[model samples]
Target: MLTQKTKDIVKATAPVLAEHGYDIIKCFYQRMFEAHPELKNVFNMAHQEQGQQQQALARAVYAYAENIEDPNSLMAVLKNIANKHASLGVKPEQYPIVGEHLLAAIKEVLGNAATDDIISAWAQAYGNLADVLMGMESELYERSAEQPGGWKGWRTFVIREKRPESDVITSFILEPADGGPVVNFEPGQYTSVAIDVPALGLQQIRQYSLSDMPNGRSYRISVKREGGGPQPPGYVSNLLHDHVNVGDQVKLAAPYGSFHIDVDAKTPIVLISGGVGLTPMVSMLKVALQAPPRQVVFVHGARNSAVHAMRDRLREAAKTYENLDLFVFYDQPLPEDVQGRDYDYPGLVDVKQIEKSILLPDADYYICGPIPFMRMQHDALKNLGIHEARIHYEVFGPDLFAE
Candidate 1:
């Protein structure tokens, strides 16, 4: 619980703190790591090296403070964090350590400007926020454990099959090492795979969408081999592509995420993706193509045929499912790629070009891709008169607040 005075203080000082949020967050992590070096195994060091986690944490904290009075307004963001935390095995005891260091960072950044009253108010607010998150995470863990064939923490899973989907993407079919039935998950939910990164000599956790419909026995994850431009190659992605193999064992957490659609809803759905972002959309498309015969429009953008995952599968699905509509856009199509035969569009995805196909009476739009790609599609939908609530997306990155 927070006092009215505390809330008022936080709302008033939030902007100033957010102005130096990046610096404060950097200091917070440095201090926390110095005090608790063991936590390095729990976080994504690659995201840290990319300098994205800092911006995400800073933005999350500011958003929390800004919405302190009406905290429920941030339920979507909170739910996202709770699911991630639950899968990461985040314990309640860690909340205090994080809060302590976060407050210290504030003091360090603000210096004399950080008065005693302000610090006390922030401490109270942070404690309250932590309580809310811990409670939600505990509930998620409990629900997962109660489900049929569910377990807590990590379970050993063996790679049953490994197949290449494209030049840049490979699909791994995993089953429990114990040979037990696994709990079912919604279409858009994801599971975390923790593997020992020999290069770093530490275990790293990465989340991947359950790319196929649940069969109550196994799950599939399609991973991309990333080494783009100046950034170093993805440590876990490349490791999975090169080192992890069929019959090899890896640890997995129970599937959990809030990005899923209501599977029972009968409304039409529009799924859009760019590059490997099509992974989760494929699962959602399969579910949508099931009984009830709901209308579904799938729009995918990729560089060319060599990089487009599941082109043949998607084409087959489109032909097999009468209610399914398929559209592909190749920004940089190869010389052999024909416009009418290979793809519907020759450039980036332009929803307006196929406006009649996508504009439904009450359709739900799901966009997953790089940040800029998502932004463009979101704006395009808005321009077409779709309500803000109808546009949903998942930021498959270190971004804590997807907005």
Candidate 2:
């Protein structure tokens, strides 16, 4: 617990930290990684190059300090971080290393501006925040370990099969190397894949949603090839797409996430996705269409049929499942694509245009897409009288939009 004085000092000095947060985070990462190079294997090196991780940490520090008096106010975002940490196998020992580097970074960046009292107060604040996260993460780890077929830390998985789903998306079916039943996961949960990136001479971890319904035997992850849009980024994804092949082994953490739908809820569901964001949607869609069927509206947007993953499969499911409805939006359909046959709309996803179809009673809306696309869909849902609590969007990395 933070004392009144410590909270006051942290709250008062938070603006300074926020202003120099980026520099402090950058220095912290540099110094920590230099001292503990092994940790690079646990972190997303791609996010570092893109600066998203640094920015997220900086924002998180300021936000925690701002709410030091009542930290529970930010429990939602904190829970998200705890889940991510649990999936990445973050341990309690790491909190101290992080705190040490963070404080040192503050001192180095601020120089004389960081008073002894300020530093001490921040130390207490960091400890308080760390305790909360450690508690939450410990609970997550314990629950997962206690579950059937759940295993702690990293487990070896071999790619049993590899197939291309689209022009840019490829699916890898991974089975546990131990030849045991894997833990069942919620439809929207993801597993952390750890593989060595030869370019960096270090291991990199990336979270990919389980793109298929759990079968107690294997998990499937569909990865998008990120080479064309960006340069020198997505090292883990590019490596998985280009180099990793069948029979290749990778380390996987148990499935964990909070974005999954409530299977018991009988209310209508609307699963929306853009580009490669359809991974988790497929899982949720498959489970939703099981016995005692429920109304599920799946909305997808892509450049064209060529990039639309599982296009024919989804089309077949829509036709076969009486309770399932699919609406595909192709912003730029190929010349071979036909109107009304290939896609319903010719532009970006506009939920408003299909208001009648999507305006089901008490429907939960799950959206996964580019940040901007998710924001647009969220706002559109709100404008259409959907409650804020009913609209959920998954952020793939860093959670820059977290509250």
Candidate 3:
């Protein structure tokens, strides 16, 4: 609980902090990393260089300050953050380090504007928020460790097979190096992989959705080679694609995520994905198909047939399953691509264009894709009169849409 004085002070200074939040976080990261170089391995340096991490931290601080009085209002987003932190094996002891550096950066940035009283108030406010997150994260860690075949921290996994899914995506089949059973995870949850990136001269970690149904033996993760162009190539993804091979060992964290299908629900399930976002959607589709009979619509969007993954498997399943509906949208089909034969839609997914086929009176919608594509789909769903509660989405990186 925060003292009323602390809440009032945080509310009063939140606006100014929002205005300078990015700079404050940027400076904090620099100072913290310099003092504790070991933490550089925990955070994504690429995100720091691109300013994504700093921006995300800024927004989070502002949101916390704004909602200090009613922190429950931010519970949903807080759960997401806690899950991410748990996946990274973030320990409770590290919270104090973050708070210390953050406070120092705030004082450094605000100068005389940051009075002792204001700083003290913010310290209390930050402590309260940290307590909330720490509690949630502690529960998550316990769940991971208590479940059958589950373990905390990093476990060694060996790549059993490496298969190319498409021109851009390759799938890695991993099993515990100890040959023990693997924990079952919700269809849409993800696991973090930590690998030594020789190029970066540091260990890097990334989360990839479990692309297959949990069989209690092995897990599958598909990696899309992010090429070097306007944006830097994905450090971990490129390494996985080009160097990591069958028989190689990698470190894996337990599955931790909030986005998943509700298998017990009777309502129709609609999964929408763009490009590599197909990973989690495929996992949910496989599990949903096996659950009690219900309508399942798998909608996917890609640039062309050449880049579309799991096409044959999906087509085969659709042929055998009556309630499953398959819809594919190719935004830029190649010259040799056939329209009606290869894809159902010719443009980016426009739900309105196929509302009659997909939109259901009682259905839950799950979307995953690039930020822009997710926004477009979200807007489209709203236009089609879908309630906000019925719509859910997952981001591959820092969540840019908390509001």
Model 2 lDDT, full chain set: 0.79
Candidate 2 pairs with clashing backbones: none
Which lDDT tens digits does candidate 2 get at residues 217-258?
A: 998887777655456547877788788899989999999887
- The lDDT leader among the candidates is 1
lDDT of 3: 0.79
RMSD of each: 4.9, 5.5, 5.2
Write candidate 1's Cα lDDT for 57-114 as tens digits.
5566665775566655566557778888988989999998899898999999999989
The TM-scores of all predictions, comma-separated, are 0.79, 0.75, 0.77
Worst 10 contiguous positions by lDDT, candidate 3:
394-403
Q: Write candidate 3's Cα lDDT for 91-194 as tens digits.
A: 98999999999899999999989899888988887787689889999999898889887999999999999998767678899999999988988876889999
Q: What lDDT score goes with residue 16 in model 2?
A: 85
Report the lDDT of model 2 for residue 345.
Answer: 90
For TM-score, candidate 2 versus 3, the one ahead is 3
